[PDB]
Amino acid sequence: YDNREIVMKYIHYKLSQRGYEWDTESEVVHLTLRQAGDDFSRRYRRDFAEMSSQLHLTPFTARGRFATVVEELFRDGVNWGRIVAFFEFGGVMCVESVNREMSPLVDNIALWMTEYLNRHLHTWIQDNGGWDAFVELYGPSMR
Amino acid sequence: TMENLSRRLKVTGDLFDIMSGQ
């Protein structure tokens, strides 16, 4: 399981979901994360507006807004739900980038997400059973 | 408002974590 592949495939899906095209055991994790992110986004929007509208995204502030939100997300701890929240948040930034006519920002966001996965989330993930444990945990929620 | 966004993400994430975990 390679974290850069995981990020690129997730972002690709999030964008194709919106009508935007953007350039097997491992397949199981991608497909599971797909459904978990869609389920997260459904629950989120039931309680809140479309996340996209509460961003105030600009090319100048994009990295600082990414780092501030993600730092606070994981400040008091990690769990699989917060990791799912991290992937959806990064997907929303990518989607909003395309919407607001800054599509090259997507490539930076994907890099920031890979960096954060490799540098700050890799330890908890490995200590907690790896991605196979996410697949195991999310199993009964698949539809 | 980035704090507002982060706390909304965390609450949904923890909810998601509780629900999918039994």
Experiment used for this model: X-ray
State whether the Cα torsion A93-A111-A69-A137 is positive or negative. Answer: positive
Chain B contact set for A80 (CB, 8 A): 16-17, 20-21
- Cβ <8 Å between A51 and B10: no
d(CA A34, CA A40): 10
Q: Are A51 and A62 in contact (CB under 8 A)?
A: no
Report whether A106 contacts A97 (CB < 8 A): yes
- Nearest Cα of chain B lies from the Cα of A84 at a distance, in angstroms, of 7
Are A131 and A125 a contacting pair, CB within 8 Å? Answer: yes
- Which residues of A fall within a CB distance of 8 Å from B13? 40, 73, 79, 81-85
Q: Which of A64, A52, A66, A61 is nearest to A100 (CA)?
A: A52
Q: What single-letter amino acid sits at A42?
A: R
**CA-based diameter of chain A, in Å?**
42
Q: Ramachandran region of residue A129, left (φ > 0), alpha (ψ -120 to 50) or beta?
A: left
Cβ contact (<8 Å) for B12 and A43? yes
Contact A137 B14 (CB under 8 A): no
Chain B residues in contact with A56 (beta carbon < 8 A)? 1
Q: How far apart are CA A136 and CA A60, in angstroms?
A: 40
The answer to whether residues A44 and B8 touch, using CB atoms and an 8 Å cutoff, is: yes
Give the count of beta carbons closer than 10 Å to the beta carbon of residue A109.
23
Q: Which helix (H) or strand (E) element contains residue B13?
A: helix B2-20
